[model samples]
Target chain A: FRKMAFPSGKVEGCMVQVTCGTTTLNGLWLDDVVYCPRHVICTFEDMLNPNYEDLLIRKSNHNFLVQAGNVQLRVIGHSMQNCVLKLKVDTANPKTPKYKFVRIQPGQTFSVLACYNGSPSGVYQCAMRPNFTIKGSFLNGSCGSVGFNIDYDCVSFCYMHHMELPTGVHAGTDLEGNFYGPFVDRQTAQAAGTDTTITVNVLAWLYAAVINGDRWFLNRFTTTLNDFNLVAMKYNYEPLTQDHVDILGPLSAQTGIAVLDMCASLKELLQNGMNGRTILGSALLEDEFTPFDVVRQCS
Target chain B: FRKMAFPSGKVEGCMVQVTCGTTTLNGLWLDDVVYCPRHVICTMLNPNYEDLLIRKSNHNFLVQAGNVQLRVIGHSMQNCVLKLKVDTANPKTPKYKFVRIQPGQTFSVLACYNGSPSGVYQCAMRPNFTIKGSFLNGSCGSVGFNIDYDCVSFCYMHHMELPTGVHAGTDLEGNFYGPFVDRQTAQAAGTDTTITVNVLAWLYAAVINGDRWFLNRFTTTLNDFNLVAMKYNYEPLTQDHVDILGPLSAQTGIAVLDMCASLKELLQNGMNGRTILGSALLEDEFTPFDVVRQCS
Candidate 1:
């Protein structure tokens, strides 16, 4: 549809510039913007990096195999009978064809850049499993979708993939309870790793990641200026710049990240700024400001 | 309580280690395999399955699943805060706090898990009907870390880049993305360990949940599956997971989503063995890189 690019050099983070609308984005990538495309889709560092061009990463069906940055991707379509591969995102766009099946028979490797109907259409939304092993078996399964897509989920140019089996669940899940042919449910799967083994399968798969040093694990989080801006504002301070950070916001008793540093800084600054202010001296507010009592200690 | 140990090393890769009832185990523990325990009570691949010994002593339950033994100590937190481990980022450090917190309140971490460091954290309060935020209890993870919905915390992990990859004040564990989750369910098939904790583990919990926040996969109805699929069977729980199993929640799992990926990877691999190798989620918009990896 519409593509926007962050001009190079003009923008600090952006490198070669990048674009998205893929499966992960599903038309919602903007919501998770730690920064526009620069760092995520592409960064100046990536653009300038000599490996940008050399880092060829791709795969296919019947099954395709490709390598990039020490990661090898193999999309094998074994016994792919009557398998229907479709990018979950394509249907989201109202203007796009309702059910324009870019027909594919079994054993035919699904290509992200295929010329089916209308031709030259959308890219794929598939990706390598967090373990980095992508079996284009069946492009379906519940517990396996959300969590997998986030971490090991690879984004191919296309969604032409299929797995042969339904994932062997050994989590001692009720299977019948959730009706998963063979798996407990969410918590159970997570306890294990394809939810990365549904246990050993993934253990075997995950160790591969450990060896490959697949840092894709870090891809799951994002710290935008907006997130920090809001955190900074929580203390009533205006941020000086909108810088992207890769720090964990401190965790609340339950779920928090690195922004704790940001909050601490703001707390100290607020304390120092309020040291001479009434809010600091007012016994009533002072008691409440005890948490902010650092004012007495801040030089 | 009794301890079950995995006899068949045939499963492979299961190292020597045991611990739990912490957050990452969510309430369940693994012998090393990815599978969570029964519903998250206990798993089968205890190196391949044996009589899981279960015994209780003063509300405390001890469960031995093969290589690991999870002793859920000090149960009945229905009234007070207890020493705990893990938070949204599964389990790591152990601390004394509430397993289930109040609305708008924060939980203190006994230990830090990768992106989610040790400290206090407020729930994001996202209502996805997923584990983290379930429209089920009218309460939510953000409302109180979703201790109700298996203690799910899609709460984002703090900035856990490679640098913060060093050891902690104690033990050692860090680096990875997530609003990983944690759970503190009421008894009955209870005391499974924080199966959904950490970036790697929590991601899987988010996958199968039938919620408004996700565009989940098919079949793997492993968790809730599809709306119709979820409502198809009524499983018993010490407490109802989501009583609104009708059209209200059975429509199609989808809800609030922003950051994290490895959690999803960890979930997918752990849950059903399905891989997201090709999955790529991101902001359709654009931004710079320098702003993303900054320290302060």
Candidate 2:
């Protein structure tokens, strides 16, 4: 129903994106027919496929419905940075009922059979565990509840990378820069000259690390590119003694080997640029990039 | 025997705390016989409690302050590297190192973390080692590893701080975030939350390991608010806090409010009022917090 409304009121939860074939609804038509926020219960029994129950209550939990149609589902949990519970799918034996019917993608998830209950039929396992462990709670593959407006959406994604990154179009600026700090090579970008916006934010996080190649990996962004090359090789770091924090480990890996050999010369300009066209100019800047990544989507 | 003593001359080895109703002995003429400190093979067969022998005793000295008797005169790998920087348990790189000994040189100033890191906490220690500024406003759950700060009692000094509301992290009505007015203004701007739980798990691992944008794009300023904000207006940080850290000084190529206001105009004037990590935290040789009193 067109990007609904939510801040934290939870009209449902986790950035809500659900889908099915055209029923096209919203509400407030008041009298002749609609009030839709997607209730559609339809039952004429055929064991009520009464049509994909709001896409299985948006993939598990309006109290339970595992899934119905569309191959692109999703449900990863157990450390969803700190997720809450809710997941179901029992099918209470129609022949050998324990339930079956799967397909999930966007790199995939949904192990199945982990109910909370809507009591559709005979399957009800309750008490959870002692010897009783069947399952419930393991979600994310596109979790949503996006922003409830403060600390949680991972404290605004750890403070939005702190208002989502910037600062490097130095020695006289304009915009386009993410070199969070210090150039690694191209002769320290020719005496601090902002080498074309810090080589376009180091060729855009190295083509967002080869198209989000399995969630954007970590070591908190190479230990924040070695503490911004030790704040630019200890930027006039006075510290004659109190042990200037005892040569903060070779004055920060000896000025973090110049942004680690200028991020190892952007993989030697993506393995031969200049006379070769640096891998067709970083594969046409990896086709105008594709990984904003809301933190390691399950990896 | 029962907890025997051994600080005279390495008697065959350490001061063992073993048991067996003691066949009764503690070093006079003794009997039951079972010596072993590598001198092995002398049992006299005492089978009632059966078996549980864990030899390999490079002899005790394993302190996180669980217990120490002290006797390493010359060397032991030079004071056993001040007890491996107090039980060093790194889950892996920058995942946990939090050390700060120096008093009687238990060895010193080591800090590696992944969890409770806020800002200005520089870390690295191979072939050389580095630490810079070092800041944290909250979290370490309860903060006590090797505990010794004594702002009169439980305030743990040098290992930075003692009980500024359980290292400023008590809320849930236990309320933390300091009594301030003095360790030169809680070391200036101590910290927050109905909070402090180790300054809220070091601002949850300094807001998920960005180390609070490496101390707001290269360490904050007015020389760290003239060593701890007497109440804001510590001037020279008004380009609107560098435009609320605009593009966080570009990911961190560090212009951080001109290196946090270029260390108090290169500390010339007051040869006093310090910061760039508060003149290397002239926190009076490690955390004192002059006490204004609050938090139960």
Candidate 3:
């Protein structure tokens, strides 16, 4: 046997992924080896057709035997984010003397059972639930081979729209030939201009909707493309006296249009603008874009 | 003839509401007179021919204008003592505008988030509307009544009192993230050990529903962590701080949990023999051992 060391001292526990033949089993391995498994125990004694208990440890938690001949294995460290232990099992009959053998994928809560001292102890559950749910906790240990890291990965996504406003003569031309005079007030800038046209970065959320079709479509964007910045623009007008910067502006916009609808309408707007028929063209741009209004007004 | 004076010396600006024969006008009044209208001058001078500047002492008399009316008439001062500049000492205070008004004054105030008006004094009028500290820091600016500075308070739900089962930080000794929770120990028990789908759903529901009481309790609790962070001189507490511990909003929640990819895979590969809930028969289901496995 070879002695293994952890990458860092912060690593409290690790899950060892072992693959032998057609079956791959994930089991907890402790550095001490005496107090192994740490939380829950799994015995693949009566499970497989030709039983695969790669490393056999008896009821005393001592004697270790290498049952499987050739196998590939990896270690996943224990951390705050990697506390959930995912394993494949057939049935959770903890009391059964001979637990029946069956294929395992991602089994449900009721399908799997965790054991302690050869008897069923805890049940698998989402981390943020009632007691009896066993997630990894702090326990200093080194794990077995293949040696890979557990990673938490996610995507960073948001919708962005770059807008251009036609300031006309109110805009001043610089040496660089770039216009820069869409001032908030005409009296101040002596021209009719507003804020500089820039990309509006709108936040969106992903959520589950109706499940459908050949595609594995489940989630959708939950943000409505609306005139969220309109009232502020209305106030920015020199002659326009609406309310205060204190006035509770429009909290929400029109909600009839979804994110898909917004994409479609914007695409159409771009097409029509490219054709030189709308104010949304090169020379002049629309004040604001409202997808619901656009769809309702379109021929 | 009636003589009147302001309530305090620091009260540099006083708005006088003159009610005479169905007419009301707010004019700025200063003790030294002329040069009174500090910002954008609004004169009801020509419009209301009745010309009701109630504290009329002519050209020398100052009048306040635009919404925050100071109803002082006939030697009686219904004057509101405006406190100048409140310090946002605690990081979790909500976005608020203190519209000081008397009982009879019909004036109202609304909270604007990052200059976009969130809602009127009432919370439920908008999404994520709650008088919790929704808009923290300087994210909220002044919106109504010509008030120069902003008064940001914790956002709250007018609908209900503090809700139960919501905790801010974990009490686990070795836990690294989140602001420390502020209340009952028993309430927060087992939170460090277990994280269920329903608990996450509860959190998402709290955020999506704009449950201010629930959110604020967490916000307030996080203040302790901020307090600790301040002493340690680390980055201050933010929504992301809470997000890492447990998400406080839908966007953050989705991001942190990789719910996007989760939905995709759950749909594509499908749950193998796994129904939404497992077959733990109500009564016959496996009961867990009493020993707290640390993991227990």
Candidate 4:
């Protein structure tokens, strides 16, 4: 595990300077970028500005009080007789324990931090709920593992943070009919202010960013310049004689945020640089151009 | 040009059905969806609920005084030299014109309606400002196009509209900025007004400019604001809440965000209502600072 410094000066709009796998590059701070065993975890407890550092998960016997920014989460604790508290990390790799549980009991406050474990040591993939409030319980109450109800809030670190409750809902069709899943299923919780850690990946760099019925393949996006090439090119490291931007871009239509076939999110990002903004940046995930998709009710 | 019928029941959340390109499909009424020679324009002049149809862009030549429901758009028309009146649309395709320019002069009330033209025409791409109020001038005085500086308003049709004059902007260094380019800019510079139009403009500008995070806060707040139309189990529209919601929208920034906070405060302080910020009620005047004093 390596502790990385946020690029000092101006960060290229929606990207960060990352040293991933033997190479130093400018890319977004996403899970996909750090593919090597040496995971780069930005500790939010240290990264948040003084004003945003007010969030703490305080615990009592059967309840917890979580406050971040202006929002508050009060767990109306319900007591159950034979219950214990334990952390559960998904067991993805059997060959090596990718994550080890931090031995914890249901008392006292624990400061939030991202760290690693070594049975070959890698950080745990914990699914925290992304909503401002969530409810869940631990499994295997008959055995030693803890079983207690918990309502957690994904506090804002100036930008949107995604977390999953232990309900196994990584991503799926939400009640709003929007399909949020896989690498993008975290709930988006945000607070006021801009000084914070992490950001959303640009839409121009996503694998699903389709244009003219073809996908712009990104070469090892180990740096900012290279990742941006995803928007700069038509094909693999290729250039365009006349950029699509010159033709037509997003316009303030009489109604909702309009979109074109290509570079709608990219054009908006470049046009409206993403510093000192509440959102993590445009294109939180592959399918997140519009705030909410409006499907036709009936033909 | 055609007057299309709104699909009877359960209109889609953010979309309305329209017949475009020789087929009737469910789509948003955005300018992009319709592409055929025959344009499909929904007439707000008729469809708006009786309370909303009250909107008429009334004209008075050098000074048009406009009122739509609770908000008003008053033109303190300062005289300009040799001004004519005409409408301008972008000249995209010459052979088969996609849109037509609406014919007009600087007098009389014009009801807001979307329409079309004939040389194989479609609806005009009129870049009306999306803000509640905007100021602009026509092209040339030496030629035929109008040349009077005019301020126009984009009234809410139950959703956020995109107008160029009141656009959210970003700088060269990628700093996201608001359209602080409103009457508040003038008011902050020691200018003042009480005519409801200027008052609304001043409040809207304060919300537009200055520092408030979250562009979507406007989206969320607007959604909540519109919910007033449906509260109390799809309540009927009332002038009481409409008047309050309208002026308050101007008061609490364009995002209407701080109003949401105050409303939360109002609800949280349900029984024991002591002193809330949003009350347009009896309060003592202390010292003169800015336009807020005039508002008080």
Candidate 3 residue A68 C-alpha distance from true site, Å? 81
Q: What does candidate 3's lDDT look like per residue over A168-222, in tens digits?
A: 1211111111222332211132423223321111111110000100111212333
Task: Give the per-residue lDDT digits (tens) of candidate 4, residues A81-135.
Answer: 1111111122111222122123221111111111111000000111222222112
User: Compared with the real two-chain complex, what DockQ does model 4 have?
Assistant: 0.02
TM-score of each: 0.17, 0.18, 0.16, 0.19
- Per-residue C-alpha lDDT of model 1 across residues B1-296, encoded as one tens digit per residue: 00001111111111111123332221211221221222122332222112222332223333333334444343222111112221122232112122321111221111122111111111121111111110111111111111221223221212111111111010011111122212232211111122111221122233333211333343222233223222322122111222212222232232212112223322344434233322222111111111111101
- RMSD after CA superposition, every candidate: 27.7, 28.8, 30.8, 25.0
The CA lDDT of each predicted structure is 0.21, 0.21, 0.22, 0.21
Cα deviation of A54 in candidate 2 (Å)? 7.3
Better of 3 and 4 by TM-score: 4
Q: What stretches of model 4 exceed 4 Å from their correct place?
A: A1-197, A201-299, B1-10, B13-16, B20-38, B41-296
Considering only chain B, what TM-score does candidate 2 achieve? 0.18
Ranking of models by TM-score? 4, 2, 1, 3
lDDT score for residue A36 of model 3: 22
Model 2 lDDT tens row, B73-159: 221111101111222222211112233321111111111121211111111111111111122321122121221221101111111
Q: Could you give candidate 4's per-residue lDDT for residues B120-178 as a string of tens digits?
A: 00011111212111111110010001111111111111111133222221111112123
